Amino acid sequence: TETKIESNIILIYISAPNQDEATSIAKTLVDEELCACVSIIPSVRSIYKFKGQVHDENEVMLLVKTTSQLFTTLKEKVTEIHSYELPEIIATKVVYGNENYINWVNQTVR
Amino acid sequence: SNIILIYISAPNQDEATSIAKTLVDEELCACVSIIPSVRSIYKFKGQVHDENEVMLLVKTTSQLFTTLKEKVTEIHSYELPEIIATKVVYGNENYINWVNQTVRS
Amino acid sequence: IESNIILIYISAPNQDEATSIAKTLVDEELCACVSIIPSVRSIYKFKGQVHDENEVMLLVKTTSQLFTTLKEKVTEIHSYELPEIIATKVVYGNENYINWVNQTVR
Ligand SMILES: [Cl-]
Ligand SMILES: [Cl-]
Ligand SMILES: [Cl-]
């Protein structure tokens, strides 16, 4: 059985400097119903150039599941509370999903 | 590119591995990357939870999404599993050809 | 309206090669940043048998315009004969960060 509804689901990558902040950010977004769930990937290394030098720092990655309709409200909350001056908040589109899960995300969020 | 990347969550390493090997063996995907030690945060009956999970990243073709979804729903211990796919917009040609030659049609 | 930023998954056999690949791409300005996930298991079929090997995953952030050049660099330096270089679309992001990626790449 083919899914018979469209997907309005997005998957947002948000980075954080440590597990403590990743978790407090994820619990806030869930509690305030700005997302349905978050998966936190530990122990990630971040490589980037700053003032001409290559850096290698540790980070934690959040994968946040929500609806396209909530992106802007979620983005504003994250930028309000994030310890970084310029955090990484980037959405990808869920093109296919199991129909029951698409419905669950839509019923769970605001 | 007709390639998709599917995120599937599992409650432990044993089930993550048996799911991944079934999908690979039955040619419903070309490969799976298993990320260990992931934390799942979600609200249940009004309370916020923080539980362990293991994440599968499955690489396959858009044409196989539905067949793979049905197989996963058949064998997954969860009543409502998470089977969500994103589109691969670009890839190296040799890899795209390999995925297409590996999977069932 | 959707953004021009992509996120590229690239697999590598160990942490040393993941890191040298990422530093080369960052230093040569083919990407703005890379996130490296350690300790991944790779499951695949080869000659009829299912294998389970260690791998390391790079998530590379860059612009759609750079995909082909970045791809050619990765295929030049990667130890695998057939690496995995697959892009997904960033449909939107925080504006300051989308601007930063676009200003950081060459
Ligand atoms: Cl900062
Ligand atoms: Cl359940
Ligand atoms: Cl090879």
UniProtKB/Swiss-Prot annotation, chain A:
GO terms for biological process: response to metal ion. Pfam families: CutA1. SUPFAM superfamilies: GlnB-like. It comes from the Eukaryota. One of its GO terms (molecular function) is copper ion binding. Belongs to the CutA family. Homotrimer. This is Divalent-cation tolerance protein cutA homolog. It comes from Cryptosporidium parvum (strain Iowa II).
Curated annotation (Swiss-Prot), chain B:
It holds the Pfam family CutA1. GO terms for molecular function: copper ion binding. Transmembrane segments: none annotated. GO terms for biological process: response to metal ion. Belongs to the CutA family. Homotrimer. This is Divalent-cation tolerance protein cutA homolog. It comes from Cryptosporidium parvum (strain Iowa II). The lineage of its organism: Eukaryota, Sar, Alveolata, Apicomplexa, Conoidasida.
